[PDB]
A paper describes a structure:
In the two slightly different conformations of the supercomplex, the angular range is 6–10°. This indicates a slightly flexible arrangement of the two subcomplexes and raises the question whether the supercomplex actively induces membrane curvature or whether it adapts to a locally non-planar lipid bilayer. As seen from the matrix side, the consensus refinement structure as well as the two resolved I + III2 supercomplex conformations include an angle of 65–67° between the complex III dimer and the membrane arm of complex I. The two conformations of the supercomplex-bound form of complex I we describe in our present study are very similar and both correspond to the closed state with respect to the inter-arm angle. This angle ranges from 106° to 108° in the two conformations, and the C1-FDX subunit is present and well defined in both. At the ND6 π-bulge, the hydrogen bond chain of the hydrophilic axis is interrupted. The π-bulge is identical in both our slightly different I + III2 supercomplex conformations, presumably due to the substrate-depleted conditions during sample preparation.
Protein complexes of the mitochondrial respiratory chain assemble into respiratory supercomplexes.
Residue numbers in the entry:
A (entry chain H): 2 to 325
B (entry chain b): 2 to 44
C (entry chain K): 1 to 100
D (entry chain N): 12 to 499
E (entry chain a): 3 to 60
F (entry chain A): 1 to 29, 55 to 119
G (entry chain f): 1 to 101
H (entry chain Z): 73 to 143
Write the structure that this text describes.
């Protein structure tokens, strides 16, 4: 157990670097779509821009408004940041490359998803601003609404696999990736992940121009940074789940010796990178829904479809006795 | 004349119609097909 | 001494619910939360006993009591909302008209 | 496989009919085309029909309800005692529903969900009666209780109805938690939740010196929960406030059906399990407290609904005296007392719902009713004398037992309490007869005549109340059958 | 070809993920002497506890 | 085995420490909306539905057709509830 | 799933078939069974119609009442037919048809 | 099929592992019985290694730990 | 020791649920009591229940409590009362319940005192049970939907009542 | 442990004792005839007498020290 | 009465449990090794 901290740090530090550079990559791909260049002055090809923004942020004076909820105001970004970090303990990157081989890892991921709402709720309430509070309530409602669809899709995958172990879920896709028969389920899962991470076209907190003040409007300096970093770490995680559940995790595209020459971590990384490109591509492509429209989509479109897909998959597998 | 009422109901509400169809196949297979397979296996 | 320690954990939660009833005569929301603390303690009792006896019946009932607790909380807070909406306040002096 | 479910045919039918009514109501109440029609009476008539078809299915399938008893054993237990208890519960629900149509039409209470919740609670009480395991017992009790919490707050803009619902939820959830803690102690001590297993574990020992304190306290807490359910003192103070504050048809329903179902549970749990003396002393002391407190508090009341609530508390005291003695005649008399109290309460609430069209609230509002409606004043006087136990009305039967057990189990303090509280009850019942017949008020309230449903129900129950002691053989035989079928 | 500038932060993220996997994989292997076994159940735990005796007491 | 949860705890502690270092280094240099109650209720109901699906999905290979149809009956009851909520406008936020 | 049809109280009449199949019980429907079925269904349609007049939905109310009556009457007829085949109800005709086929 | 292979492998080596464990437990129980006889010497009425079960059927010695197998 | 730490955390957090001036803080301390309970369940080896207490109690029930309490904007005056006068009645009630129930198992479940001898060597291992072990999840799922399916369905009826009653009591359609 | 379902997916530790006690009580018209089997079942449930005896041993060790 | 436990209504478990005695979840562990 003495080397466990080394493993945990070898997970957490590169994740914080990967998030720093996800912000950069988002600014670069959006720029290129818009015929612009993006950050390219601060470091060669702009590669030192993350470091500069982080150092700027830590050198900013904290504000700490005169609220009766001094402690909760500072604790809310810690809460969300911690929740975003702790989900990676059960994520397998390759065969045997995982910190905790939880037999209940699927339900554990669902539980972390469910805990994610409290940081936003508490930030909104503790800010002593009715705009922040209302924006927070709307964001929390949206998150819990789309968690229902996320959970029912998790149930579909679990029915196919018959085990909550994430490594087992990956290794059950050796015959075929689950995203081929369940391609509509993959589509609905990617959309539900956009709505759960509060990302475009569902990013209410970004719609300040729209008279919608986000839950983190009062935050400055590093609390504001912790909210932003938690949100982006959640996007890489949701891209990793899309990869694990439907694109066969670390497995190669084809069971051929030429494809088995490159290791599984490279396959996993490439699929994660494809999904992160799509998160940015969608932000760059479409306008955003109003709150009532996306709430209607959550309850009236994605709950029914997810439930119907659970019924159809379980019934088809029970009929022909293809169950795990 | 309940044949275009179904047509309108599909036109207005395609997600509901698709959910009913997908879940209905999921219910139909074990209800009907599965006893057919079990009987075909008995003989 | 394992069983006694788990049991006293659950028992302290139950007693805390009782005290929370006893200590909140102006605060009916905390009374509802004290009842939820008692229900949690009972669920813990069932799970601990299930383990101690090597018997599954305590786990089946724990799950069902979970469903019941959720339903009770939803209905309880609905009644709280309509009580507040009618009166404009949650103070106990406005919910004491029926008497004798 | 399909034939196994013949044992749950009545429940399957009533649940599916409830779903059909829920869908029908929500579809046509939202319809702009029909101008959002009030559907409370329509769904009420359809639900009354559903209850009568359920009753037909249950009563005409007496041997089939015991089919597949080993497959169904870990879920419930159907026998003759459950058969008759469920028939009586369905009859109570049908009568209560038939007493609600004028309330739906004239107050314009348009919510059809009222009928749906009544039917769902009827399902819950049906499952309560056949419960044969602590888990199933608790689940059915919770289903019934949640339906009652929601219907107690149905007049959602009324201060009284919201207050009633809030007190019901808090005191009901508290009592349910206490009862659940008792179930956990019993399970931990015996490793068993099934009533048969609990019977085998607990018989032959009772308090044999080395008594399991876990079992004893599980029993005590479960007993506290049951006593809350039957409104026995000192677990009663929720009842008068909820009875007053709830809409009057809710008060009528809560007065009858839950008592039938909870007493079925109490019989099958306690009379059948085996801790013994303490369990009966619990009910003895609570019966005495209930009789005394109910009599005094009713004597203090000036409003009709509160008087009826306190009268019901006193009468459950009288009934529980039968459970206290722990003999065959005790169980028989408990069942007879429940049946007669239910019919009398149905009579009384039919009259109350009839007078609620002119908003009766106080006992003084009944002044000069023998002039404005002489036959209604006679029918109501008959009910009050029956409540007071004056022979040869049906109410005497239950009073007769009280003293029969008091001189049978050898308890003269119980006899003295019964004599004094009977006199007090007689006083506050004949005060209503005095108000309707002897008083000459300056201002009279003229009451609208009742509808056909309530007049027919009133005529039948009044004929029963005056004439039951002429032909009481069927009830005596059937209750003796039920008391025997508890053990064999 | 300017669009390759965008492929650098993405490649750095992919390398960060490859580190998050492989670095923890090689540290566990050094500490235990063999790679981590996926699906360690009660049987494998009991086998390890028995193998300790069968090795050390030999 | 529960052995695999200990790394999660040490991970939590380390994440806490990182959080406090990042947050601390800078310190060195009246309108009730019922629609939120209603969305909470809906979420709670379907949360319990996902909860009851987890054991069913892992146990489908043993419970066979009986288990499938009992879960279908469960879903049917809860979906009738959902249709009631839909027709009553609890799913509309305009 | 292990099953056991055995009842607590034994059948008091010749047991023609212990666990008759669904279609066998439906095919055992007699004239009295159809009379019970039709009476329940007709009463239910009538109650649906009469209670639907005031809200203005007599037709839809008729369909709803008829569905409730159809389910209840079919269940009642099945109950009687299966009880006769199992020996729980007087089953003269069942035994007469059994002793011949 | 893969899981069935692993379960087959575990089933065949089961008897030797159980026999080893049985020998170990018997030797340890003998040692503990000598210890109990030593300590409980001079205490009248003691019976060394008495079976608390009236049926006399063998049960493993209770540990007093609720769930020791999972950790 | 670990059980002592968890018990102490739960005891303080529960006191803060029943004694906090602000009900929002009360709901937040309740989340801490549920987290501690999850830890206890992990110690007992019931990881499914440990996760479900997180998902349902914290993820769904506490959220509903928080939404309602936050939007109510309760003023501290409407719910404030001094609790020094309740120390005697709390003392008697709590002491009776303590002396009677913290020691209810002691006669029935007598604790095994830890001796200065290695009793771990007398743990008997039966390998037959370990060939194909069941998780908490599949052990529960083996029973919920077949042998005890009726109670499962009654719980569904309970949930249906909650949905109906929530709509009927609070809905005001725009 | 009277149901038979063990928490690890096998027969419960105390099921056989329960079944012995039940089978004895099914034909013995006196509960005292099955007292030994009943206390066997309850001993399996709580290990009261076993732990009491081991505590006696520990107490004697502490006394002789 | 004298020994209600003796009656056949009260011995449901003794006749139903043998019918499920081979069901996965309640078997003696050695049964899988020999069968
Ligand atoms: C507008 O969007 C942006 C942000 O602000 C919200 C960012 O968070 C950031 C900057 C933040 C980062 C992700 C930088 C990387 C994160 C870190 C490893 C820590 C952040 C701070 C530092 C670089 C300095 C570290 C100093 C200490 C606190 C002492 C510990 C040694 C970017 C890239 C950005 O453009």
């Amino acid at each position: 157990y003495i080397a466990v901290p080394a493993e945990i740090l070898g997970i957490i530090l590169p994740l914080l670097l990967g998030v720093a550079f996800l912000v950069l990559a988002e600014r670069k791909v959006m720029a290129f779509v818009q015929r612009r260049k993006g950050p390219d002055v601060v470091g060669s090809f702009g590669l030192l821009q993350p470091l500069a923004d982080g150092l700027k942020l830590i050198l900013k004076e904290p504000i700490s408004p005169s609220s009766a909820n001094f402690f909760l105001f500072r604790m809310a970004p810690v809460a969300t940041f911690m929740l975003s970090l702790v989900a990676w303990a059960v994520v397998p990157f390759d065969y045997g490359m995982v910190l905790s081989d939880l037999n209940i890892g699927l339900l554990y991921l669902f539980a972390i998803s469910s805990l994610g709402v409290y940081g936003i709720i508490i930030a909104g309430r503790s800010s002593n601003s009715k705009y922040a509070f209302l924006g927070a309530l709307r964001s929390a409602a949206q998150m819990v609404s789309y968690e229902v669809s996320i959970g029912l899709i998790l149930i579909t995958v679990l029915i196919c696999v018959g085990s909550c172990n994430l490594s087992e879920i990956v290794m059950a896709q050796k015959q075929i990736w689950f995203g081929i028969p369940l391609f509509p389920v993959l589509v609905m899962f990617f959309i539900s992940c956009l709505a759960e991470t509060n990302r475009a076209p569902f990013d209410l907190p970004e719609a300040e121009a729209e008279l919608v003040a986000g839950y983190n409007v009062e935050y400055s300096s590093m609390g504001f940074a912790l909210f932003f970093l938690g949100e982006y770490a959640n996007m890489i995680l949701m891209s990793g789940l899309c990869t694990l559940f439907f694109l066969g995790g670390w497995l190669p595209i084809l069971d051929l010796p030429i494809f088995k020459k490159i290791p599984g971590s490279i396959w996993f990384s490439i699929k994660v990178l494809f999904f992160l490109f799509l998160y940015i591509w969608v932000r760059a492509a479409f306008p955003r829904y109003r709150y009532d429209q996306l709430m209607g989509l959550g309850w009236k479109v994605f709950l029914p479809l997810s439930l119907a897909w659970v019924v159809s998959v379980s019934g088809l597998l029970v009929t022909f006795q293809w169950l795990p | 004349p309940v044949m275009e009422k179904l047509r309108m109901f599909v036109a207005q509400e395609p997600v509901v119609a698709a959910s009913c169809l997908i879940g209905g196949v999921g219910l139909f297979l074990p209800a009907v097909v599965r006893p057919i397979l079990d009987s075909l296996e008995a003989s | 001494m394992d069983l006694i320690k788990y049991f006293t954990f659950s028992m302290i939660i139950f007693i805390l619910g009782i005290w929370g009833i006893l200590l909140n005569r102006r605060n009916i929301l905390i009374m509802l939360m004290s009842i939820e603390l008692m229900l949690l303690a009972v669920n813990l009792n069932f799970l601990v006993f299930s383990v101690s006896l090597d018997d599954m019946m305590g786990q089946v009932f724990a799950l069902l009591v979970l469903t019941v607790a959720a339903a009770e909380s939803a209905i309880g807070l609905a009644i709280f909302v309509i009580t507040f909406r009618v009166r404009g306040t949650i103070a106990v002096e406005f919910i004491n008209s029926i008497q004798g | 496989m399909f034939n196994l479910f013949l044992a749950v045919f009545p429940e399957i039918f009533i649940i599916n009919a409830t779903f059909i009514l829920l869908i029908h109501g929500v579809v046509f109440s939202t319809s702009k085309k029909y101008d959002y029609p009030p559907l409370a009476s329509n769904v009420g008539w359809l639900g009354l029909l559903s209850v009568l078809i359920t009753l037909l299915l249950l009563a005409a399938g007496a041997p089939l309800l015991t089919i597949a008893h080993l497959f169904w054993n870990n879920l419930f237990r159907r026998d003759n005692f459950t058969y008759f208890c469920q028939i009586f519960l369905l009859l109570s629900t049908a009568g209560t529903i038939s007493m609600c149509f004028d309330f739906f039409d004239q107050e314009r209470f348009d919510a059809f969900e009222f009928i749906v919740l009544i039917l769902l609670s009827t399902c819950g009480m049906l499952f309560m009666i056949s419960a044969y395991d602590l888990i199933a017992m608790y689940l059915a009790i919770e289903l019934q209780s949640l339906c009652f919490y929601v219907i107690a707050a149905s007049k959602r803009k009324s201060e009284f109805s919201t207050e009633a619902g809030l007190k019901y939820l808090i005191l009901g959830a508290f009592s349910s938690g206490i009862l659940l803690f008792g179930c956990s102690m019993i399970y931990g001590s015996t490793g068993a939740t099934h009533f048969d297993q609990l019977a085998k574990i607990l018989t032959g020992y009772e308090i044999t010196g080395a008594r399991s304190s876990g079992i004893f306290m599980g029993i005590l807490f479960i007993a506290v929960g049951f006593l809350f359910k039957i409104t026995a003192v000192p677990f009663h103070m929720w009842a008068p406030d909820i009875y007053e504050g709830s809409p009057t048809p809710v008060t009528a329903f809560l007065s009858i059906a839950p008592k039938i179902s909870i007493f079925a549970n109490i019989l099958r749990v306690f009379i059948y399990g085996s801790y013994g003396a303490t369990l009966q002393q619990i009910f003895f002391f609570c019966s005495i407290a209930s009789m005394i407190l109910g009599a005094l508090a009713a004597m203090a009341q000036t409003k009709v609904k509160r008087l009826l609530a306190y009268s019901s508390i006193g009468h459950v005291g009288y009934i529980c005296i039968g459970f206290s003695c722990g003999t065959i005649e005790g169980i028989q008399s408990l069942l007879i007392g429940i049946f007669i109290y239910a019919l009398m309460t149905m009579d009384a609430f039919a009259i109350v719902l009839a007078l609620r069209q002119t908003r009766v609230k106080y006992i003084a509002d009944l002044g000069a009713l023998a002039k404005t409606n002489p036959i209604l004043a006679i029918t109501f006087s008959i009910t009050m004398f029956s409540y007071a136990g004056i022979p040869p009305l049906a109410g005497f039967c239950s009073k007769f037992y009280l003293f029969f057990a008091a001189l049978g189990c050898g308890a003269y303090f119980l006899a003295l309490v019964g004599v004094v509280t009977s006199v007090i009850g007689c006083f506050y019942y004949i005060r209503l007869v005095k108000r309707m017949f002897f008083d000459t008020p300056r201002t009279w309230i003229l009451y609208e005549p009742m509808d056909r449903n309530k007049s027919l129900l009133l005529a039948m129950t009044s004929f029963f109340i005056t004439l039951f002691l002429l032909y009481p053989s069927p009830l005596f035989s059937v209750t003796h059958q039920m008391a025997l079928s508890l053990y064999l | 070809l300017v669009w390759l500038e965008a492929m650098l932060p993405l490649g750095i993220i992919g390398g960060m993920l490859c580190i998050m996997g492989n670095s923890q994989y090689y540290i566990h292997k050094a500490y235990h002497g063999r790679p981590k076994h996926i699906g360690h159940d009660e049987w494998d735990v009991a086998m390890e506890r028995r193998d300790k005796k069968v090795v050390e007491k030999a | 085995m529960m052995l695999e949860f200990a790394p999660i705890f040490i991970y939590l502690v380390i994440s806490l420490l990182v959080s406090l270092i990042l947050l601390g280094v800078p310190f060195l240099f009246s309108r009730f909306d019922i629609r939120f109650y209603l969305v909470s209720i809906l979420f709670l109901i379907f949360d319990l539905e996902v909860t009851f699906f987890f054991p069913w999905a892992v146990s489908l290979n043993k419970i066979d057709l009986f288990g499938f149809w009992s879960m279908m009956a469960f879903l049917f009851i809860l979906t009738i509830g959902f249709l009631y909520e839909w027709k009553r406008g609890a799913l509309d936020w305009e | 799933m292990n099953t056991d049809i055995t009842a607590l109280e034994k059948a008091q009449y010749p047991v023609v078939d212990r666990n008759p199949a669904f279609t066998k019980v439906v095919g055992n429907f007699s004239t009295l069974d159809y009379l019970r079925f039709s009476t329940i269904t007709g009463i239910s349609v009538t109650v649906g119609y009469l209670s639907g007049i005031k809200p203005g939905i007599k037709g839809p109310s008729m369909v709803t009442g008829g569905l409730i009556g159809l389910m209840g009457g079919f269940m009642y007829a099945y109950q009687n037919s299966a009880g006769r085949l199992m020996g729980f109800f007087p089953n003269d005709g069942e035994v007469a048809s059994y002793q011949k086929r | 099929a893969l899981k069935e292979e692993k379960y087959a492998a575990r089933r065949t080596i089961l008897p030797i592992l159980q026999a080893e464990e049985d020998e170990r437990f018997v030797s340890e129980w003998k040692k503990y019985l000598e210890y109990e006889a030593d300590v409980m010497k001079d205490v009248p009425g003691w019976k060394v290694g008495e079976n608390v079960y009236n049926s006399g059927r063998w049960m493993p010695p209770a540990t007093g730990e609720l769930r020791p197998d999972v950790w | 020791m670990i059980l002592s730490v968890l018990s102490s955390l739960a005891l303080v957090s529960g006191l803060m649920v029943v004694r906090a001036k602000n009900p929002v803080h009360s709901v937040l301390f309740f989340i801490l009591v549920f987290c501690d309970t999850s830890g206890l369940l992990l110690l007992l080896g019931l990881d499914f229940f440990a996760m479900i207490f997180l998902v349902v109690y914290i993820g769904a029930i506490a959220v509903l409590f928080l939404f309602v309490v936050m939007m109510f904007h309760i003023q501290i005056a409407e719910i404030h009362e001094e609790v020094l006068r309740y120390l005697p009645v709390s003392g008697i009630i709590g002491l009776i319940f303590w002396w009677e129930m913290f020691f209810i198992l002691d006669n029935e479940s007598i604790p095994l005192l830890p001796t200065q001898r290695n009793t771990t060597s007398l743990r008997y291992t039966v390998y037959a049970g370990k060939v194909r072990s069941w998780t908490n999840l599949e052990t529960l799922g083996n029973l919920l939907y077949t042998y005890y399916f009726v109670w499962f369905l009654v719980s569904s009826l309970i949930l249906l009542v909650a949905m109906i009653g929530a709509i009927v009591l609070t809905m005001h359609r725009t | 442990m009277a149901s038979g379902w063990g928490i690890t997916g096998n027969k419960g530790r105390c099921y056989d004792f329960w079944m012995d006690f039940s089978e004895c009580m099914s034909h013995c018209r006196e509960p005292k005839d099955c007292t030994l089997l009943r206390e066997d079942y309850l001993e399996c449930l709580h290990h009261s007498k076993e732990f009491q005896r081991r505590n006696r041993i520990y107490k004697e060790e502490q006394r002789k020290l | 009465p004298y020994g209600f436990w003796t009656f056949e209504r009260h011995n449901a478990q003794l006749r139903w449990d043998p019918q499920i005695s081979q069901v996965a979840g309640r078997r003696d562990p050695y049964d899988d090794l020999l069968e």
